[PDB]
Structure formats: C-alpha cells, structure tokens
C-alpha cells in the first residue's frame, strides 16, 4: 500500500519536527536555571 508508506514518511517527518521543538524548549530551560544560579551567586 504505497499510500500507507507515504503516510508513515509524512508522520515521521512531522514527529522529528516535534522532537526538535522539545529539544529547543530544553535549551531554554538550561538558560533559565543558569540565570537563577547566577542571580543567587552574583
């Protein structure tokens, strides 16, 4: 079923995008925590 194969490719590409979003959220959380530790210290 060539149409099912194309749905799987389109689904997995979009899931790979959702993961890149969650990864960037994670970079923002590290900065937020670092900002908190810098405040307390400095």
């Amino acid at each position: 079923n060539s149409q099912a194969i194309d749905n799987l490719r389109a689904s997995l590409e979009t899931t790979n995008q959702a993961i890149e979003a969650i990864r960037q959220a994670g970079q923002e959380m590290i900065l937020a925590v670092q900002g908190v530790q810098d405040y307390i210290n400095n």
Partner: protein, 32 residues
C-alpha cells in the same frame, strides 16, 4: 535588580506548545 528569567520560560512554553501542535498533526496523518 529583581530575578527575571521570564523570557526563557515563555520561549520554552512556546517551544512545547509548538511540539504539541506538530504531535497532533503527526497522529492525524497516521489516522488517515
């Protein structure tokens, strides 16, 4: 001099809200 990392948390909240919309899209492609 007041602690504010509000720009990081709001961008993180935007990144996770985007992930959520992309996940619903992925699931609907598989529904199809």
């Amino acid at each position: 001099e007041r602690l504010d990392v509000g720009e990081n948390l709001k961008k993180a909240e935007e990144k996770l809200k985007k992930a959520e919309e992309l996940l619903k899209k992925s699931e609907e492609i598989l529904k199809k």
